[PDB]
Design an enzyme around this catalytic site. Sequence first.
Site, PDB file in Angstrom:
ATOM      1  N   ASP A  87     -44.036  66.596  82.637  1.00  0.00           N
ATOM      2  CA  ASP A  87     -44.082  65.633  81.545  1.00  0.00           C
ATOM      3  C   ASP A  87     -44.815  64.374  81.969  1.00  0.00           C
ATOM      4  OD1 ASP A  87     -41.497  67.253  81.693  1.00  0.00           O
ATOM      5  OD2 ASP A  87     -41.438  66.564  79.577  1.00  0.00           O
TER       6      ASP A  87
ATOM      7  N   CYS B 125     -56.462  70.815  76.516  1.00  0.00           N
ATOM      8  CA  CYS B 125     -55.153  70.255  76.650  1.00  0.00           C
ATOM      9  C   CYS B 125     -54.969  69.511  75.339  1.00  0.00           C
ATOM     10  CB  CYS B 125     -55.036  69.406  77.935  1.00  0.00           C
ATOM     11  SG  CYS B 125     -56.560  68.326  78.330  1.00  0.00           S
ATOM     12  N   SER B 126     -54.561  68.259  75.363  1.00  0.00           N
ATOM     13  CA  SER B 126     -54.460  67.562  74.095  1.00  0.00           C
ATOM     14  C   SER B 126     -55.778  66.870  73.735  1.00  0.00           C
ATOM     15  CB  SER B 126     -53.319  66.532  74.136  1.00  0.00           C
ATOM     16  OG  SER B 126     -53.142  66.005  72.842  1.00  0.00           O
ATOM     17  N   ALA B 127     -56.337  66.084  74.646  1.00  0.00           N
ATOM     18  CA  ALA B 127     -57.652  65.498  74.347  1.00  0.00           C
ATOM     19  C   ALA B 127     -58.814  66.274  74.937  1.00  0.00           C
ATOM     20  CB  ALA B 127     -57.722  64.045  74.859  1.00  0.00           C
ATOM     21  N   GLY B 128     -58.558  67.238  75.812  1.00  0.00           N
ATOM     22  CA  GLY B 128     -59.631  68.034  76.337  1.00  0.00           C
ATOM     23  C   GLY B 128     -60.404  67.329  77.425  1.00  0.00           C
ATOM     24  N   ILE B 129     -59.786  66.381  78.126  1.00  0.00           N
ATOM     25  CA  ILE B 129     -60.531  65.689  79.200  1.00  0.00           C
ATOM     26  C   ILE B 129     -59.706  65.566  80.474  1.00  0.00           C
ATOM     27  CG2 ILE B 129     -62.035  64.453  77.639  1.00  0.00           C
ATOM     28  CD1 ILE B 129     -60.285  61.984  78.100  1.00  0.00           C
ATOM     29  N   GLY B 130     -58.374  65.590  80.374  1.00  0.00           N
ATOM     30  CA  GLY B 130     -57.542  65.240  81.535  1.00  0.00           C
ATOM     31  C   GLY B 130     -57.134  66.439  82.361  1.00  0.00           C
ATOM     32  N   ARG B 131     -56.081  67.136  81.926  1.00  0.00           N
ATOM     33  CA  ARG B 131     -55.746  68.390  82.581  1.00  0.00           C
ATOM     34  C   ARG B 131     -56.867  69.378  82.490  1.00  0.00           C
ATOM     35  NH1 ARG B 131     -49.836  69.281  79.929  1.00  0.00           N
ATOM     36  NH2 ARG B 131     -49.209  67.086  80.292  1.00  0.00           N
ATOM     37  N   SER B 132     -57.575  69.415  81.349  1.00  0.00           N
ATOM     38  CA  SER B 132     -58.666  70.354  81.226  1.00  0.00           C
ATOM     39  C   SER B 132     -59.735  70.080  82.264  1.00  0.00           C
ATOM     40  CB  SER B 132     -59.287  70.236  79.819  1.00  0.00           C
ATOM     41  OG  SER B 132     -58.370  70.753  78.893  1.00  0.00           O
TER      42      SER B 132
ATOM     43  N   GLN C 160     -58.402  61.853  83.871  1.00  0.00           N
ATOM     44  CA  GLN C 160     -57.965  60.651  83.169  1.00  0.00           C
ATOM     45  C   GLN C 160     -57.211  59.666  84.043  1.00  0.00           C
ATOM     46  OE1 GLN C 160     -56.164  62.844  79.485  1.00  0.00           O
ATOM     47  NE2 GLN C 160     -56.964  60.915  78.673  1.00  0.00           N
TER      48      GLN C 160
END
Length: 279
Positions: free
Chosen positions: A179, A213-220, A260
């Site tokens: 989380d 992921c959610s914005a497509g930049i961090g975990r992705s 991020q």
Amino acid sequence: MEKEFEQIDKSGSWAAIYQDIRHEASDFPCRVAKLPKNKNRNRYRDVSPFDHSRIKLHQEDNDYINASLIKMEEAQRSYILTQGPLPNTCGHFWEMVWEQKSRGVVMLNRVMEKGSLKCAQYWPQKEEKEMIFEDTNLKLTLISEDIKSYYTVRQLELENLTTQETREILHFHYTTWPDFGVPESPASFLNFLFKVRESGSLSGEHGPVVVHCSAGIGRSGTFCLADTCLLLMDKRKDPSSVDIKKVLLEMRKFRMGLIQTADQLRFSYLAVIEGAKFI
Ligand SMILES: [Cl-]
Ligand SMILES: [Cl-]
Ligand SMILES: [Cl-]
Ligand SMILES: [Cl-]
């Protein structure tokens, strides 16, 4: 790299290295993403695809989707990085998968995290309740799923209702990213990446894997960065010549904001160091 990592850790300079990346990152126009008519196609007003690398939809309608083609030339791999679909862009999302000939979709979030929605429920959870996307004329059926403790792999059937052609799409869903922060150990994440690789979904025989992921930049970003660095380490004569910061800046020519936080940057280093030892 494992020495550079230990030194950055000893020096406590992850935030400094990370802010350097942010300062050096490419800046290209995102005119189309910012058009008034695309306001409700963007999950985050601060995360947009560059015009030069955005994925264009092919049907006779607005061609816009918040998705970017990352084409890593030396590593000879491509990825589509995209935001978690919105309730009104799930049809566009699957249209993109169809048109780009993707075999795999990699999801790095849960649909709800910390009690907040990160992503629409864009695939069917029950075999007998298929999804029809009437705007893009696609049907999506859950065929089976293999639920493991830290990830799930789903077999989905995507049917173009216009032609009645069907394709099997593999949905690789990493379900245990914490989380807050990043995983303490990259073992699960690496095992997940290696399962995606083993599936063939990242091969050049297919269209690019769709990662979100959610914005497509961090975990992705961590997923594609780790995958590409590990490819570079296998290919180069001196694998310690692979400079993760340079690879990340190259990826950021194609989509803004990849990785991020300084913690994600450290995690990517850790995943690459550990993944290289495995291989
Ligand atoms: Cl979920
Ligand atoms: Cl591979
Ligand atoms: Cl490099
Ligand atoms: Cl950034």
